[PDB]
């Protein structure tokens, strides 16, 4: 069965005293005016439960909680037993063992952080077949930190079951320290307004409460329809790698590139991605990828990285300080080393200067070490510009050959022929969608364009340097990106002292783009009481064709008042008409007078304050 | 002739176009787009980049608010003087010299 829990489930949020204050608590509570289940059975324990039972002869004993129906709480004739054990439970009527309709019982059950909390309250009632109307708070009873997981529960034995949901409440702590009232902050616009001004009374006026944003209905990915995988194996499972001073640069293009193949390959002793997190490459897109391959000892592999210094960094192969890509190195001792010491791998050691990044040098002129010109004299004072390697597998592991590849790519905002494995979806337009073009994540409304892009441009841009125009990676059509419609939410309220009715103002929207707790919020979303003004969509007021003095100012010459009772919307009137009977020979003269005393109030001073720098910022530290 | 009204409109135009144009600065991170950071890093360091953009945009918005608040006092003094002029010149004959 079902029923309506008007205002229940409020429990003291924590063991902290407050007085005459109106607090704001964000915690798991039971929303007011909620459809809750009525019983005279296995029931789930979502996150929290509001159990309220009316009985007179104690027809109920306790509860059973857990997932694999686990802890028992029961109340026999006099005492109560609390313990968690493996029991022989369809029940009918160890870690810890805490064995210690006129009457109404409300219980709140929560297990957060593994701590089990019980809140309780009793009250006399002379009522039948209905939840009593009133406000009451549930004090804590006992905290048991069993540290077990629970998914469902069932009582021991009419009653009601309510579930707690994440909500924020405005609670009212009296001088005696007891919550005599509360506000469900999400129930209706009026409650939200009472939240913004932390009081249960709201004077007449207009109040801005929240921001309203249309939400992405769906998600759209548009990627190139190319199919051939990037020949990563040809780069890695190749025949042999060139000597470092002549590092091969092999480009990768026009291919879908799965990088999970490199991740799952567990023969890589160093996989550190620099410009991007490795686990996101499969969804990005790239302009072009360069694979630079060469062989270096493990000690000198550290030279191959952005913004470092070393002989190979300066004389042979330099990665710039703003490198974009991933660096892959692995052992190839079995396939890149001779028995007597291989010297096929060579490196440049006698150069006249350093190298700018990505610069290859094949210079073949004798290096000078003395002060005399070399003139092709090899030996003293003139060295050969290169140096050799010694490759025997009998040395320390730091000296073994390491085939090292730098998967350099430009992640520029460019045509991006290369992409990852991502499944393109059909293109839907004119709707607020969470699109994804070539990795340009974002949300908005896409429409046809009257623009013309240059045959190499990939997307437009706004003055804010934000994307507002794109070309479809599959159909080459210009699309218009407009951010999803939005605005502020204002509540048009006659004072709470006067009425609980409210009207809602949506700022800068068209009354069709507005579509929320439905039993309260949705009433202020449709009907024949929706009005569109120059300040946005006004919902909850009647557009009368009269005109009166401005009572609550909406905007653009529109004011709204509470009249008959309901709320009206009118174009304000400046004042009463008149026509002074002017004539060339007609004057008017007073025959009496009046002495009228009026008042002007003018602020003169304000409280004098003085805040200490150290005491406020650091205090006693 | 209408220099003052146009100046007010223009000072509103800039210092607001400046605020919009300030939404595209690195402030020390890899990119000026949050999503570009989001779609390129794990949260443990995309957090650092987003934090740097947050600090930059917070300084920018606070500075803009302060300038607007100061300009508001100037416009308010002008409007109070205009109301005084309306009451004393329009609703009467003034004996104040050059007012």
């Amino acid at each position, epitope marked *: 069965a079902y029923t309506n829990s008007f205002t229940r489930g409020v429990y003291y949020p924590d063991k902290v005293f407050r007085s005459s204050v109106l607090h704001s608590t964000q915690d798991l509570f039971l929303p007011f005016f909620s459809n809750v289940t009525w019983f005279h059975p296995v029931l789930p324990f979502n996150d929290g439960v509001y159990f309220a039972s009316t009985e007179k002869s104690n027809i109920i004993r306790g509860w059973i909680f857990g997932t694999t129906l686990s802890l028992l709480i029961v109340n026999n004739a006099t005492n109560v037993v609390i313990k968690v054990c493996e029991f022989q439970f369809d029940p009918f009527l160890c870690t810890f063992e805490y064995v210690s309709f006129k009457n109404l019982r409300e219980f709140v059950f929560k297990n957060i952080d593994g701590y089990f909390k019980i809140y309780s309250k009793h009250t006399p009632i002379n009522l039948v077949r209905d939840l009593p109307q009133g406000f009451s708070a549930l004090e804590p009873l006992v905290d048991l930190p069993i540290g077990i997981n629970i998914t469902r529960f069932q009582t021991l034995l009419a009653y009601y079951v309510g579930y707690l949901q994440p909500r924020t409440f405005l609670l009212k702590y009296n001088e005696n320290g007891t919550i005599t009232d509360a506000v469900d902050c999400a129930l209706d616009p009026l409650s939200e307004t009472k939240c913004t001004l932390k009081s249960f009374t709201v004077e007449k006026g207009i109040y801005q409460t929240s921001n309203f944003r249309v939400q992405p209905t769906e998600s759209i990915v548009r990627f190139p329809n190319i199919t051939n995988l990037c020949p990563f194996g040809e780069v890695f499972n190749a025949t042999r790698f060139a000597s470092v001073y002549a590092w091969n640069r092999k480009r990768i293009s026009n291919c879908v590139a799965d990088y999970s193949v490199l*991740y799952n390959s*567990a023969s890589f002793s160093t996989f550190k991605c620099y410009g991007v997190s490795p686990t996101k490459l499969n969804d990005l897109c790239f302009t072009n990828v360069y694979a630079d391959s060469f062989v270096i000892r493990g000690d000198e592999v550290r030279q191959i990285a952005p913004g470092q210094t070393g002989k190979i960094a300066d004389y042979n192969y330099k990665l710039p300080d703003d490198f974009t890509g991933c660096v892959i190195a692995w052992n190839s001792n079995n396939l890149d080393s001779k028995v007597g010491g291989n010297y096929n791998y060579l490196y440049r050691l006698f150069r006249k200067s350093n190298l700018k990044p990505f610069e290859r040098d094949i210079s073949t002129e004798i290096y000078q070490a003395g002060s005399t010109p070399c003139n092709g004299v090899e030996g003293f004072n003139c060295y050969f510009p290169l140096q050799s390697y010694g490759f025997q597998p009998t040395n320390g592991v730091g000296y073994q050959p390491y085939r090292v590849v730098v998967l350099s790519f430009e992640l520029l905002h460019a045509p991006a022929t290369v992409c990852g494995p991502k499944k393109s979806t059909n293109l839907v337009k004119n709707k607020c969608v969470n699109f994804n073009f070539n990795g340009l994540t974002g949300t908005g409304v896409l429409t046809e364009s009257n623009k013309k892009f240059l045959p190499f441009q990939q997307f437009g841009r706004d003055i804010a340097d934000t994307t507002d125009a794109v070309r479809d990676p599959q159909t080459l059509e210009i699309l218009d990106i407009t951010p999803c419609s939005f605005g502020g939410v204002s509540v048009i309220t006659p004072g709470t002292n006067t009425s609980n009715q409210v009207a809602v103002l949506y700022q800068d929207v068209n009354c069709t783009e507005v579509p929320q707790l439905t039993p309260t919020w949705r009433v202020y979303s449709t009907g024949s009481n929706v009005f569109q003004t120059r300040a946005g969509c006004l919902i909850g007021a009647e557009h009368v064709n009269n005109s009166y003095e401005c009572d609550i100012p909406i905007g653009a010459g529109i004011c709204a008042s509470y009249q008959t009772q309901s709320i009206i919307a009118y174009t304000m009137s400046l004042g009463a008409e008149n026509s002074v009977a002017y004539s060339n020979n007609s004057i008017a003269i007073p025959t009496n007078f009046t002495i009228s005393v009026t008042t002007e109030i003018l602020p003169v001073s304000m409280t004098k304050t003085s805040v200490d720098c150290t005491m406020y910022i650091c205090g006693d530290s | 002739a209408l220099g003052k009204l146009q100046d007010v409109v223009n000072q509103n135009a800039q210092a607001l176009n400046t605020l919009v144009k300030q939404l595209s600065s690195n402030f020390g991170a890899i990119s000026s787009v949050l999503n570009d950071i989001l779609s390129r890093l*794990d949260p443990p360091e995309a957090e650092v980049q987003i934090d740097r953009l947050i600090t930059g945009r917070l300084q920018s918005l606070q500075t803009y608010v302060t300038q607007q608040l100061i300009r508001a006092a100037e416009i308010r003094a002008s409007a109070n003087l205009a109301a005084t002029k309306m009451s004393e010149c329009v609703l009467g004959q003034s004996k104040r010299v050059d007012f």
Partner: nanobody, 121 residues
Framework: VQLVESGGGLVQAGGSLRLSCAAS????????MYWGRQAPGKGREWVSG????????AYASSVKGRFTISRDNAKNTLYLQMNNLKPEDTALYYC???????????????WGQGTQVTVSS
């Protein structure tokens, strides 16, 4: 920093073993530890990775779907539970400190004591 690994032994097909190592000289909650094995006389390999929190786990393609990785931050212990074990897995296994925190890149600046793991029938 100090590392001593525990576990390992003669294991037959379908068997299990538990490896653990502590980290001192730093709290170890921030850093990420990988599992590395070198077959004798061959190259070192990356077996599996764990996120700094413990939520994200990655494995080599070789051990995907067969091995269980788990670590406990509070007593600083990293564990590896291995299923469908075989003579193919024979290697010296290393738990390494990745020198860095709150990042997912996989490589190690340091190498632990290692364990001698002999797999035979």
């Amino acid at each position: 920093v100090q590392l001593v690994e525990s576990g390992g032994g003669l294991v037959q097909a379908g068997g299990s073993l538990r490896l653990s190592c502590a980290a001192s000289g730093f709290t170890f909650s921030n850093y990420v530890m990988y599992w590395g094995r070198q077959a004798p006389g061959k190259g070192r390999e990356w077996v599996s990775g764990i996120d700094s929190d413990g939520s994200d786990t990655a494995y080599a393609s070789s051990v995907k779907g067969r091995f269980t990785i788990s670590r406990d931050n509070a007593k600083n212990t990293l564990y590896l539970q291995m299923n469908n074990l075989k003579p193919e897995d024979t290697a010296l296994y290393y738990c390494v400190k990745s020198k860095s925190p709150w990042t997912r890149s996989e490589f190690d600046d340091y190498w632990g004591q290692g364990t001698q793991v002999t797999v035979s029938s």
